[PDB]
Amino acid sequence: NLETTVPYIFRLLKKLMGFERLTLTIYDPSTDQIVVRATSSGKFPKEGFKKGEGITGKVWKHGVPIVIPDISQEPEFLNKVWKRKKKKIAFIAVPIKSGGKVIGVLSADKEINEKDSLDEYTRFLSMIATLIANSFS
Amino acid sequence: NLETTVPYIFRLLKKLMGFERLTLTIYDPSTDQIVVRATSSGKFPKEGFKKGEGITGKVWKHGVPIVIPDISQEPEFLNKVWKRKKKKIAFIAVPIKSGGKVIGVLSADKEINEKDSLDEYTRFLSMIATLIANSFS
Numbered sequence: 001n002l003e004t005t006v007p008y009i010f011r012l013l014k015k016l017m018g019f020e021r022l023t024l025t026i027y028d029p030s031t032d033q034i035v036v037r038a039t040s041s042g043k044f045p046k047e048g049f050k051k052g053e054g055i056t057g058k059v060w061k062h063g064v065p066i067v068i069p070d071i072s073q074e075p076e077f078l079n080k081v082w083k084r085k086k087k088k089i090a091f092i093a094v095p096i097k098s099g100g101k102v103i104g105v106l107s108a109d110k111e112i113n114e115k116d117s118l119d120e121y122t123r124f125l126s127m128i129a130t131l132i133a134n135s136f137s
Numbered sequence: 138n139l140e141t142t143v144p145y146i147f148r149l150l151k152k153l154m155g156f157e158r159l160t161l162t163i164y165d166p167s168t169d170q171i172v173v174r175a176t177s178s179g180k181f182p183k184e185g186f187k188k189g190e191g192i193t194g195k196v197w198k199h200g201v202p203i204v205i206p207d208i209s210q211e212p213e214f215l216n217k218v219w220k221r222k223k224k225k226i227a228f229i230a231v232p233i234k235s236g237g238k239v240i241g242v243l244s245a246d247k248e249i250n251e252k253d254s255l256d257e258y259t260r261f262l263s264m265i266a267t268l269i270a271n272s273f274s
Contacts, residue, residue, distance in 0.1 A: 012260060016253070016257060016261060120149060120153060127268065134267075134268075
């Protein structure tokens with residue numbers, strides 16, 4: 001039921017904080033990829049990432065967050081789940097750790113305000129990732 | 138060590154969301170009151186609330202959040218920890234539940250924007266309260 005309780009978190013983070021395209025991926029043993037579990041919209045395409053595949057897969061492989069300040073300017077950015085098109089949008093992907101291992105990945109887009117910092121957003125999302133790993137137990 | 142890990146949460150909620158005077162109180166068996174554990178500032182006065190005492194104590198007694206849209210307009214508001222003085226400030230206090238009981242109370246001030254709603258803030262803080270009860274175990 002992460003399909004019902006995480007989009008409550010996502011809805012709120014969209015309304016209060018200007019996050020967009022929030023994506024939760026969880027590890028699938030069968031396909032050995034972290035697979036889309038819930039997103040911030042009305043439809044979850046069940047796309048997956050192998051270790052090291054795109055930004056999302058690298059966060060999974062190396063267990064460390066990655067900030068893309070402008071998605072237009074990083075070709076390692078696959079655009080696999082949301083197939084976006086056309087301003088200066090940032091991307092942040094944090095690891096979800098449980099059992100002291102990386103069980104999957106949370107991410108979000110953000111149009112960056114001059115007065116905000118992506119380090120602060122990243123740390124926040126790592127805090128939300130914590131709250132989600134708790135469900136996972 | 139909630140004295141070190143919760144003010145990291147509070148600092149971020151101040152920076153990203155305009156919360157002020159964030160207060161965590163935890164139950165003290167010895168005095169039978171929920172006592173200030175951490176706040177959003179450089180100094181924690183160790184004030185406590187008995188069940189039913191002020192807004193904070195009522196949230197504790199009845200295990201249900203309470204929103205004060207304007208603190209100037211509610212006399213049940215004690216102003217016990219922060220002794221504030223002098224705009225139109227809102228107050229929100231949510232229960233912290235663990236072991237299926239109320240172990241204490243989280244609260245925060247907020248100058249309310251026309252385009253924001255206090256129901257959404259309240260639900261958010263209840264989400265943060267969740268994240269804190271997890272520390273508590």
